[PDB]
Amino acid sequence: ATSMAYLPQTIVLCELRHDASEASAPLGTSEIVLVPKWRLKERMKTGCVALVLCLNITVDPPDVIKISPCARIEAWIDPFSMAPPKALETIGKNLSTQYERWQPRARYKVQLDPTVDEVRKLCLTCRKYAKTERVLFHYNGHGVPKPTANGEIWVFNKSYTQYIPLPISELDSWLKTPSIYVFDCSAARMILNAFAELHDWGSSGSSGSSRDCILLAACDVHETLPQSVEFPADVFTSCLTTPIKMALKWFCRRSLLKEIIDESLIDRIPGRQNDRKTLLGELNWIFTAVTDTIAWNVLPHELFQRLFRQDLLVASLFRNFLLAERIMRSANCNPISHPMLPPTHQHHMWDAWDMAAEICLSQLPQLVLDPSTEFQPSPFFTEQLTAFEVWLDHGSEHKKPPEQLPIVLQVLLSQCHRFRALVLLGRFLDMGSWAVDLALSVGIFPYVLKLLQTTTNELRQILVFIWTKILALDKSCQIDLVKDGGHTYFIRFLDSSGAFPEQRAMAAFVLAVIVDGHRRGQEACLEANLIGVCLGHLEEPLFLQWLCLCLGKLWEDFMEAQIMGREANAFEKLAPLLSEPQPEVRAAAVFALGTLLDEFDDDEKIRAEDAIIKSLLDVVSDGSPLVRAEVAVALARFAFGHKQHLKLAAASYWAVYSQCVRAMFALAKDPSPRIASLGRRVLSIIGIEERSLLPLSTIYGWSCGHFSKPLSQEIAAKREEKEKFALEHIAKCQHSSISKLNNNPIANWDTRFETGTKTALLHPFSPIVVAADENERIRVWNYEEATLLNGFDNHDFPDKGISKLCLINELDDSLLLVASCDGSVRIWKNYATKGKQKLVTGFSSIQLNAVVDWQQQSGYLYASGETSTVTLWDLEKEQLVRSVPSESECGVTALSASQVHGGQLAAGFADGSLRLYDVRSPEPLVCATRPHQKVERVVGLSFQPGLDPAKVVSASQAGDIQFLDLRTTRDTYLTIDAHRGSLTALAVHRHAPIIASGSAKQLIKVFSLQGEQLGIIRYYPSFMAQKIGSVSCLTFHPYQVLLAAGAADSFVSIYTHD
Amino acid sequence: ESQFEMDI
């Protein structure tokens, strides 16, 4: 109902630019610099391949064999179907054609049943071809004996009478640093166990590595390859080189029991490996996706990046190796790689492959009956995208990565489910920096970089979002976006057939990052008319912010863009933003105007640069430190050019340059100490006390924080908690018949203010006093616990003077305003903590004996003093909304804003006069009256407790409190003569009908609103100076009948009414 | 020169 007038919802100074404990980020400090770990530059190439084939045909080595069925198919050929020399040719050809499909642009060399010297040359030659590039050595010892414990491969002599051993040391001497080996022989570990012992131990911090020597062995030390006819001899090679063919042929014999499904249809599968819209290519695609996923969840960032991203062939071999892991296992063989890798067999994900290969192979019978192209695409991708969704909703933390992530990647490659994958990816990127780091670890970057070439307007809104998130984390993608012409993508999105300025802010932000200190990005965006595009929209606050930050970064340190800025009238379109309500907008405008910069002469630029610096000097005295900081950096920039002019101006002070010097010295004494040190930097650049000395802007770096971040119920609980206490105790104050004062004080607290207490303030919702010295020290005393809670120095400047203490946002987390006699205002968070009290904002109100009052309702701060005007500040905007002429011709001594009626204000004057204002009116002065007729200053005043514009007001120093309501009559309601002269303080309650006055004799008289003397208190001195003559602090508790009083001695005493 | 083939 009506008492909602007492209880405002206007919160103020609780935005992200006023941030609290962990971050002093909110300007001043530079942005958080990044150090990435996803940087393997070298796309590595396996440029040469050496195939070696030791299979003496129908000459089994004397190691085991025995089996009557025994397997001997190789490269999918029966070697007993062509006679030795042509069989061994065909196997050599097929096997290279097999490998060649994985790396078609390497060079391939085959050698069949070779001598040691032939192999010496093979390997020596493969070095010379691919110098830095990797070499692949494939060895097949099926017709020779098993590798040794001495570390040996077996090869032949010319006449084939002997098996000649070939030391691993010699192979490793012929091939060198970048190389990879495949061994499809029996006891193959044996080779790797030799390799590990070749070189001295050291040169790494992994298991037992050093070089770039990669090894793929077919089975263990004690193991022999399978002889069963269900497998070939070629199992490991066939897994690594023909994975699909093997995976299905295996799936037939094992799982389904083979006899329903003709196994030779696997040779005749329709389509090619390329076409994802054919049954072969799509099955190949599912396999890639399945296997790539098993690797990513099983392996760590680094090892995954080395084996599965770096080298296209190594990627494929180690991918296909995970199939060997599984198949070989079923045939009593346990293959190993040198970078060892954890167990991957029977990972959940092989189940999803098995499902899809069963759904494929049942379809295969009918597709041969006729090429019908009734090829039903597999649900697999849809199914896994849904499992990623499930993860994103339920379990949306860092509770171990999503697993479906490398499948989301594969889906981006075809249009089939691209939009939803991109949607789910963005949704995933949105959860934070950690999730971007994960996306870029999978290898999403270049695929999402390619999609900036897609014209499809469906994808554009999601692609901007994805790129925002990436560039919010990693600024360095700058280089790659410009080199591929991705910058044009976002400029078109700024022109926009589409709508939504939240999306266009992103687009402006993305371009700001692309450009930021990137002279090729500046140049590329300048050629695309980004100035013109941006300036077009300058004819929502976030969008205006980023339109400026984009232009700012584009101008910066680039005379060609600056010239385009002037002649496109950037100044004339930017300047009106300098007076926008949001400090974020103003500060950004200042940054942009700032980066356009860099006797009697006029050319084009001097007009612009004079007009720019004039407009920036106009916002020197701004309410928000955010803006002032930017103005100070832009002044430093301007100062850097015109040092000679500005030195001569500093001589005479101690046309436009004289204004500049005032602004430096004004900034040098600013109430925000970071702004103050900024101004002191500018002074030292001028030489009042190499481009590296210039201070650097922060608005851009702060604002980026928005995007590097996702895109309540306790807050409202403690809000309503206090509202209950307020409304209940309001009624109590009013309706309780307030009996006499209890003269026995509850406290007589020694502040140790040597000079004494000058003001104080009671807290509404807790047992706290705040008191202040004449030199603006602040103590936060507790009157229920009898304990100190904090100690300050409000500012470190030598010229002191306390003027006022107020509470802003009483209803949720109070901030302590501390106004000073020079007009500066400082508002403090966490003032009740032991010593963790940050300065939220400081601005100089009044541009003296300043007098200040805060109107929580309207968000207005009123300030004035020995000035002709009452200055009006709007702390939601942090602007000087209005300068109201007092129309007095003497000083404002006291100043009370109405807590009920926003805009309305009472003002006590030095001559004893008294004025109402309605600051929300074309004529602000409502009425002007004397009351109390001695010509002495109005030491205090206030609006009468209630919902009317009446006024307890006008305690004059002459001694007389005068009551008057200015609706009906000028003359006084009621006079009370508290003191014979020397009235030094007044205290008027917010709700209870009660007042108290203070005397510069010794004395405190409490009165009813009607006039009854409810109490007298005499503040007695402690030694005999007889100086209790600044009984200055007198203040009632907002919601309780509790007085607080302090003098020109040292004791802040509290009293109550029984 | 991408690892997996894209269809733009």
Side-chain angles (χ1 to χ4, degrees), chain A residues 43 276 308 413 418 447, chain B residues 1-5 7:
Chain A
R43 153 51 45 76
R276 294 171 175 123
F308 292 80
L413 308 172
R418 180 175 287 168
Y447 302 102
Chain B
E1 56 166 37
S2 186
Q3 179 178 11
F4 306 116
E5 192 163 29
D7 292 296

Side-chain angles (χ1 to χ4, degrees), chain A residues 334-518:
Chain A
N334 298 260
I336 0 82
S337 44
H338 164 253
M340 211 211 87
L341 67 83
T344 53
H345 84 279
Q346 268 287 94
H347 187 249
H348 130 72
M349 203 59 50
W350 281 129
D351 299 21
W353 158 259
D354 286 347
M355 262 203 78
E358 202 183 358
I359 293 158
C360 158
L361 290 179
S362 51
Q363 191 185 123
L364 195 64
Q366 298 176 18
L367 287 183
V368 178
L369 271 167
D370 73 313
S372 66
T373 183
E374 291 200 317
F375 155 64
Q376 284 173 17
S378 296
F380 180 83
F381 291 115
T382 304
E383 289 178 17
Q384 240 99 17
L385 287 165
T386 317
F388 187 61
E389 260 204 324
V390 165
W391 195 94
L392 291 168
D393 308 331
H394 265 60
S396 206
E397 308 181 32
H398 338 323
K399 275 205 178 194
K400 313 295 172 174
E403 179 154 312
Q404 326 311 333
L405 223 187
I407 280 159
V408 172
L409 181 80
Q410 296 294 309
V411 170
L412 300 174
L413 308 172
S414 185
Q415 195 178 35
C416 193
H417 292 113
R418 180 175 287 168
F419 181 79
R420 98 167 270 217
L422 288 166
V423 159
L424 300 183
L425 172 54
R427 223 163 148 186
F428 177 60
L429 298 188
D430 201 15
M431 15 208 79
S433 58
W434 69 280
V436 175
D437 198 288
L438 279 163
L440 302 173
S441 179
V442 164
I444 272 163
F445 183 77
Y447 302 102
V448 169
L449 188 71
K450 273 189 186 175
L451 298 171
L452 296 170
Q453 299 170 305
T454 321
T455 317
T456 314
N457 285 341
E458 194 193 62
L459 304 180
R460 69 201 258 154
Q461 292 200 332
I462 224 302
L463 281 156
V464 171
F465 184 79
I466 288 158
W467 274 110
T468 291
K469 301 262 76 180
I470 295 158
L471 291 166
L473 175 70
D474 195 5
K475 199 212 293 178
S476 62
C477 310
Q478 262 187 359
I479 309 144
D480 300 76
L481 288 154
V482 178
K483 284 183 176 177
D484 279 295
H487 68 275
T488 307
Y489 198 77
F490 305 100
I491 297 166
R492 291 185 189 203
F493 196 87
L494 271 184
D495 279 339
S496 86
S497 290
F500 223 89
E502 303 296 331
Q503 304 289 323
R504 295 179 189 169
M506 276 145 45
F509 156 71
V510 163
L511 281 157
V513 175
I514 284 159
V515 163
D516 182 26
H518 196 53

Side-chain angles (χ1 to χ4, degrees), chain A residues 306-336:
Chain A
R306 190 192 161 188
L307 302 177
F308 292 80
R309 254 66 204 155
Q310 200 153 244
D311 194 309
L312 306 194
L313 181 53
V314 178
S316 302
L317 295 183
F318 269 80
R319 206 167 336 95
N320 301 344
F321 181 75
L322 306 187
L323 180 67
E325 205 85 67
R326 206 187 177 199
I327 292 177
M328 302 299 287
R329 208 80 82 187
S330 65
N332 289 317
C333 281
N334 298 260
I336 0 82

Side-chain angles (χ1 to χ4, degrees), chain A residues 743-956:
Chain A
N743 212 329
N744 271 313
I746 299 164
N748 188 46
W749 171 53
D750 193 13
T751 44
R752 292 209 140 288
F753 293 152
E754 305 101 66
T755 58
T757 320
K758 299 298 177 296
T759 182
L761 167 138
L762 285 157
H763 198 283
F765 308 123
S766 80
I768 284 170
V769 201
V770 181
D773 205 339
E774 78 180 8
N775 39 50
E776 300 177 61
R777 295 176 207 165
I778 297 154
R779 316 296 185 190
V780 180
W781 204 56
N782 192 296
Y783 57 84
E784 193 175 333
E785 299 280 10
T787 189
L788 267 170
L789 300 173
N790 212 324
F792 282 59
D793 288 316
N794 190 63
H795 84 79
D796 291 351
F797 294 105
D799 299 48
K800 315 286 195 180
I802 184 68
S803 169
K804 248 269 172 157
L805 299 169
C806 305
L807 295 175
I808 306 166
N809 309 315
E810 292 192 358
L811 302 168
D812 47 9
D813 207 329
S814 52
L815 307 169
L816 177 59
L817 189 147
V818 187
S820 309
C821 302
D822 73 337
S824 32
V825 173
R826 326 216 180 202
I827 300 160
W828 294 92
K829 200 173 283 145
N830 294 117
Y831 66 85
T833 321
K834 284 177 274 184
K836 288 221 169 198
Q837 17 86 307
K838 79 206 78 264
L839 174 60
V840 175
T841 287
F843 62 101
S844 15
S845 70
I846 307 170
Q847 297 152 11
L848 174 62
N849 296 329
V851 187
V852 160
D853 204 33
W854 168 239
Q855 199 168 61
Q856 187 54 84
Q857 183 72 84
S858 61
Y860 294 161
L861 185 79
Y862 301 81
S864 131
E866 217 84 37
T867 329
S868 60
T869 51
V870 182
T871 295
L872 184 69
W873 293 86
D874 182 344
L875 297 192
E876 197 199 313
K877 304 184 181 192
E878 311 195 60
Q879 295 194 275
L880 201 159
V881 159
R882 155 95 102 154
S883 278
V884 175
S886 64
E887 274 144 28
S888 176
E889 308 212 324
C890 69
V892 172
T893 323
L895 200 64
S896 176
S898 175
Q899 274 162 69
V900 178
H901 317 284
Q904 203 180 107
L905 176 79
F909 288 85
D911 65 354
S913 70
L914 178 66
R915 278 157 247 258
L916 256 47
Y917 301 95
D918 176 37
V919 100
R920 297 174 161 168
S921 190
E923 78 302 313
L925 210 184
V926 170
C927 74
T929 201
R930 222 71 164 175
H932 50 49
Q933 63 153 37
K934 204 89 169 183
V935 185
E936 284 178 43
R937 70 184 212 278
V938 177
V939 74
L941 60 40
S942 162
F943 285 83
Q944 252 167 244
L947 300 156
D948 312 343
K951 267 172 23 138
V952 145
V953 164
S954 271
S956 174

